[PDB]
Amino acid sequence: STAEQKTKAKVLLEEGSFLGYEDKLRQRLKLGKDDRPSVSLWSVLKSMVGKDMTRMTLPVSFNEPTSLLQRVAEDLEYADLLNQAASFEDSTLRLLYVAIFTVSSYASTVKRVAKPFNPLLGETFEYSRPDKSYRFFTEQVSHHPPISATWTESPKWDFFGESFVDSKFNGRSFDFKHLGLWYLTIRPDSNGKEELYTYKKPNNQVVGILLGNPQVDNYGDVKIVNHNTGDYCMIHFKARGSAYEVKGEVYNAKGGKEWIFGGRWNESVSAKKVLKPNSLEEMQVTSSGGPKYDGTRFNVWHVNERPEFPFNLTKFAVTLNAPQPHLLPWLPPTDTRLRPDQRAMEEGRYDEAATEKHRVEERQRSVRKKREEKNITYQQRWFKKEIHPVTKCDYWKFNGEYWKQRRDHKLADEGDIF
Numbered sequence: 001s002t003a004e005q006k007t008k009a010k011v012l013l014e015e016g017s018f019l020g021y022e023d024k025l026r027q028r029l030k031l032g033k034d035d036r037p038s039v040s041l042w043s044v045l046k047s048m049v050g051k052d053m054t055r056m057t058l059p060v061s062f063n064e065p066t067s068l069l070q071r072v073a074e075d076l077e078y079a080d081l082l083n084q085a086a087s088f089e090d091s092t093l094r095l096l097y098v099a100i101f102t103v104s105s106y107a108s109t110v111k112r113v114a115k116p117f118n119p120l121l122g123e124t125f126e127y128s129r130p131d132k133s134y135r136f137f138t139e140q141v142s143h144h145p146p147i148s149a150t151w152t153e154s155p156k157w158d159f160f161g162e163s164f165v166d167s168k169f170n171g172r173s174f175d176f177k178h179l180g181l182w183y184l185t186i187r188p189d190s191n192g193k194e195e196l197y198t199y200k201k202p203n204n205q206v207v208g209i210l211l212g213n214p215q216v217d218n219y220g221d222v223k224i225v226n227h228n229t230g231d232y233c234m235i236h237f238k239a240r241g242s243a244y245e246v247k248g249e250v251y252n253a254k255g256g257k258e259w260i261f262g263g264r265w266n267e268s269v270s271a272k273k274v275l276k277p278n279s280l281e282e283m284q285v286t287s288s289g290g291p292k293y294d295g296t297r298f299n300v301w302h303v304n305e306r307p308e309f310p311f312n313l314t315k316f317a318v319t320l321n322a323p324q325p326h327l328l329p330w331l332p333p334t335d336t337r338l339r340p341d342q343r344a345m346e347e348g349r350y351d352e353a354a355t356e357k358h359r360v361e362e363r364q365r366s367v368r369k370k371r372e373e374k375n376i377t378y379q380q381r382w383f384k385k386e387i388h389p390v391t392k393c394d395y396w397k398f399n400g401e402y403w404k405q406r407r408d409h410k411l412a413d414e415g416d417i418f
């Protein structure tokens with residue numbers, strides 16, 4: 001445990017990051033299943049061609065009782081990969097595991113053809129895992145357009161970025177682009193100063209709509225750069241032409257190919273050392289013991305087992321919106337767990353969900369109109385837009401106050417949106 005890792009771990013404990021997380025993770029929903037009718041997606045969308053996800057009104061069959069804030073937290077489902085990454089002295093092998101971490105969060109998107117809640121302006125969501133030593137926090141920093149800012153911290157790695165989802169139904173497919181930059185910091189166990197990786201997430205689309213069998217597809221190219229070394233990785237999510245294929249190549253700073261990896265992003269990813277730096281070889285689509293330098297293949301990631309849950313949620317997703325008894329007294333009034341329309345929907349009370357949604361959305365609009373009448377500039381509570389010193393891009397800088405003020409029971413009047 002390096003000095004900087006211990007210094008980070010000490011901060012996390014002093015700020016009380018795990019207070020209130022004593023309850024065992026939620027294992028299921030009160031709903032055992034549910035019988036929202038299987039309305040045809042085309043029948044709904046044919047009258048809304050060219051619209052955005054947020055401008056559409058959808059039946060509950062195409063809603064999910066999670067927030068966009070919580071879908072972004074599903075980036076962390078396989079965060080163990082990042083501690084593994086920190087343990088490798090070879091920077092290109094750290095990059096391999098960082099890359100596969102970025103791929104690992106797409107298995108959970110399958111079988112959830114549904115719109116998550118559009119977070120209210122100022123809505124927040126926190127999630128800490130004492131068993132993993134990380135804390136995640138996010139604030140909805142914009143409503144027009146919808147933007148979430150995140151900030152995740154752990155002894156060996158940080159992860160933060162902007163969720164800016166730009167969507168469009170073109171009459172055939174529903175397309176989603178992720179416009180924000182993501183920042184992943186590793187504090188290596190050895191042989192390396194703290195290092196910064198950046199990348200943008202792949203696109204997603206709903207296809208099969210006209211065929212009557214909607215399917216979530218993730219597609220496009222991703223490039224991860226290590227700003228310190230500076231290794232880089234190219235990732236290719238193949239677009240549907242039922243192929244879930246993903247492949248990637250990891251290069252050192254001189255363009256030498258060091259690693260390739262590939263698999264199906266709904267199932268598993270394997271990798272191998274590339275022995276000749278100029279090889280054109282890419283992963284063709286049996287050691288489960290860790291990395292290998294001799295060129296044999298090794299497993300890196302496999303999807304978690306996925307029981308049947310209402311709304312087709314994953315086990316990990318079931319933990320996120322849990323109103324855990326020991327957690328509730330710590331939360332700000334803005335936390336997604338307290339959001340009443342989303343809570344009603346999770347419990348299968350769909351008319352209550354529609355009733356509460358109308359109320360909280362009306363109040364949001366009225367507060368915006370009052371601000372505009374008084375020339376009042378909206379200010380985020382927990383983030384401020386700044387210029388990042390390395391990328392020179394605008395980013396949402398966490399102000400460092402949330403967890404300390406939470407520790408000190410100072411949140412009771414930090415927002416009133418539900």
Ligand SMILES: CC(C)[C@@H](C)/C=C/[C@@H](C)[C@H]1CC[C@H]2C3=CC=C4C[C@@H](O)CC[C@]4(C)[C@H]3CC[C@]12C
Pocket residue numbers: 053058062068071072075105109112113114115116165174176201204206216
């Ligand atoms: C009419 C309905 C069916 C339309 C709007 C719903 C489309 C779904 C499939 C879209 C809507 C929002 C999309 C969405 C938003 C945010 C992220 C966070 C990112 O880190 C992983 C992908 C992910 C999770 C994607 C996956 C695909 C989602 C969930």
